[PDB]
Amino acid sequence: MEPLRVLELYSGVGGMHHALRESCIPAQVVAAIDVNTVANEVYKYNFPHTQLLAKTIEGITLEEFDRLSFDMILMSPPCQPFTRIGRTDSRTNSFLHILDILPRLQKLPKYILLENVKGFEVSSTRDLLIQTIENCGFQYQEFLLSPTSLGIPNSRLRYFLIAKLQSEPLPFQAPGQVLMEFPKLSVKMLKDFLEDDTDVNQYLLPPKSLLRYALLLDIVQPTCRRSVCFTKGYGSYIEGTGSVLQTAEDVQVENIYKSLTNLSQEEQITKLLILKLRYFTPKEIANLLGFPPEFGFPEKITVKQRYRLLGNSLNVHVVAKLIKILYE
Amino acid sequence: MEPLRVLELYSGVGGMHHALRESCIPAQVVAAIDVNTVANEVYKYNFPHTQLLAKTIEGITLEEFDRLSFDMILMSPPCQPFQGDMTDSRTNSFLHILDILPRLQKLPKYILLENVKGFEVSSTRDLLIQTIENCGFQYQEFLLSPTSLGIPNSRLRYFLIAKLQSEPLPFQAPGQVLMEFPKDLSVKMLKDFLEDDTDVNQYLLPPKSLLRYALLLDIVQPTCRRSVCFTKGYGSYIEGTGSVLQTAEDVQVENIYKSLTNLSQEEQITKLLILKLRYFTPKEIANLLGFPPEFGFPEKITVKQRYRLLGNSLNVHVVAKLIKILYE
Ligand SMILES: CCc1ccc(C(=O)NCC2(C(=O)N[C@@H](CC(=O)NCC(=O)NC)Cc3c[nH]c4ccccc34)CC2)cc1
Ligand SMILES: CCc1ccc(C(=O)NCC2(C(=O)N[C@@H](CC(=O)NCC(=O)NC)Cc3c[nH]c4ccccc34)CC2)cc1
């Protein structure tokens, strides 16, 4: 009788929208707003029947906002575009316009849920945002949660703020506190998130990369229940970007390591290849991020862009549970 | 106990040597080893009477390690700004260290290593631990940030302290990485780490960058008792590299935020300059890192080079306490 109209800011590749669906709450995306042409392509490919406003948030007038009549705002960080080799940030103005439009709306949205990076919870920008929603009478709670809490073998500590237009306090509210756990199963293995049709070749680490960074790598095996944070650089830079997968069981990493001693560069390359280390594929990162099994990219989107498009994405599973918590 | 001869691997700017002096333990550095020309100039400038071997660790033979007759190994991550021979020396150096340890005529009694967080779950750590266990060392790993000693800087790093002895360490937690020092410390303000000589200009934030990233910034005031991790990119890349300092006072950050609303680019740029945001100086970062007041660079070192040389540096104060804990 009362389906929620949802506004998705910085829709990117549609992580929020996907979280909306997994929450199984009565809602629908009335509008997606993002200027990234490559991201929007990914968005249409997975959400063809959803309106996508390819505009900056600052360029969307209050009249348009009132017309959309949204009851829920969902926003996650903007996709970091591969700058055209020749080589603008509307973020400050877009964020200010959001703060400026909210009090002037004809219908305040009942729900607000924002996902940002860790560290935001101490910024001056947070204090101004919190200040505005308090003036508008939102009861809120901030979180810092990693998908490991929901049993996903992937570290991705991110910031969350859930806001609800109600006078009463929230049942789980810790005033002035960032909660580190969901309000009151285990960590699955990585093999559950691996695509079995993936070309193991092509994704195998190149030999010169193995030679230089072999012992600086974080090598995980498929039975491992852990993996490090993925950044936009995965697949192009090797240090600090993510874990790599050893697709050659019954070979012990520490044995390859010790046997490299007193070997030539060529013999080490030959030895390290035995481990059959490979990158996680873009689709496999999306699995760990919680994108639905049906999620995919247009073929025109390069592998490099796919890693980049996912590097800054939210975790659909973590956001989906908070949506449920927020909706009761 | 008689005077301890200390070996400093990947000396860099000499954080390990500065920590040894702050430990106030009977020891001196008989050999500093690093191949970075820039870093070694800084090392010579501060420690002119210390032997500095500008060679790769893999290149130092066993007899020369035996002839050095060291009782303590201190190793810190290489300066990592990234020698004619084309060869990454990291792998062969680390494996060379492991292959030399058992073959030494004198095992060092003390071993202290500092590394980045995340190392404690690597296959490399496992091979390292295995080797020191088989050599008879008693060890304990830590993950400590300078805030545990009252320093207003976040910088979680990995530490391994090893000691050649039969008895276990009084604080030894087998199979655990301790997050506190084994059992004044009130976190001090950033005032006590700033330099009065510092030209507030020169380091002031430029207008172009203060317009794109103004609200993406972690702006800290001198009365604050906190700051984020500094990285090599600081002073060049704004986002994620470190906090920026607000020198103009009695001005409240959030007001300047709201006043950017509906203003033009040039009009916004003008309101933000009021905040008088400057970078932390390379020296000021060294103060937060714990380098002694006497620590300085040669003038020929560019400010850009000074920033990179400190990005991956250890914290002298935290290491110094562990050196004491180890010597007992
Ligand atoms: C140093 C720590 C810090 C401080 C501030 C911010 C931030 O966000 N200041 C607002 C901003 C924006 O437009 N922010 C964007 C997101 C963004 O840029 N994240 C950083 C990033 O991806 N860097 C590569 C919109 C947004 C999405 N979820 C949110 C939840 C709450 C408030 C705002 C948001 C004008 C610049 C971030 C980090
Ligand atoms: C992903 C997690 C991870 C895994 C491995 C390592 C590492 O260390 N693999 C050894 C090695 C090296 O050369 N290690 C260097 C340190 C280094 O490069 N750290 C990474 C960095 O600074 N990234 C910006 C020397 C060193 C100093 N303290 C130590 C304590 C124990 C063992 C080794 C060391 C190739 C031979 C680091 C992190």
Numbering used by the authors:
A (entry chain B): 1 to 87, 92 to 188, 248 to 391
B (entry chain A): 1 to 82, 88 to 188, 247 to 391
The authors write:
For our crystallographic studies, we used a deletion construct of human DNMT2, dubbed DNMT2Δ47, in which residues 191 to 237 were deleted since this region is predicted as intrinsically disordered. The asymmetric unit contains two very similar DNMT2Δ47-compound 3 complexes with an overall rmsd(Cα) of 0.354 Å and the largest differences in the loop region comprising residues 82 to 95. We could show that DNMT2Δ47 with bound compound 3 is indeed dimeric in solution at a high protein concentration of 10 mg/mL, which was also used for crystallization. Most interestingly, compound 3 is bound in a largely hydrophobic pocket adjacent to the active site. The indole ring of compound 3 is located in a hydrophobic cave formed by Y10, M75, backbone of S76, P77, F99, L118, F124, and L133. Additionally, the amine group of the indole ring forms a hydrogen bond with the backbone carbonyl of E119. The amide group, which connects the ethylbenzene and cyclopropane moieties, is in van der Waals contact with P78 and R95 and forms three hydrogen bonds, namely with the main chain carbonyl of L278B, with the side chain of N120, and an intramolecular H-bond to the amino group connecting the cyclopropane and indole moieties. The largest local movement upon binding of compound 3 is observed in the loop following β4 (M75 to P78), where P77 and P78 are rotated and shifted toward the SAH binding site. Moreover, the active site residue C79 is now resolved and moved into the SAH binding region. The superposition depicted in Figure 4D shows that binding of compound 3 narrows the active site, which prohibits SAH binding due to steric hindrance by P77, P78, and C79. As a consequence, compound 3 acts as an allosteric inhibitor by reshaping the active site.
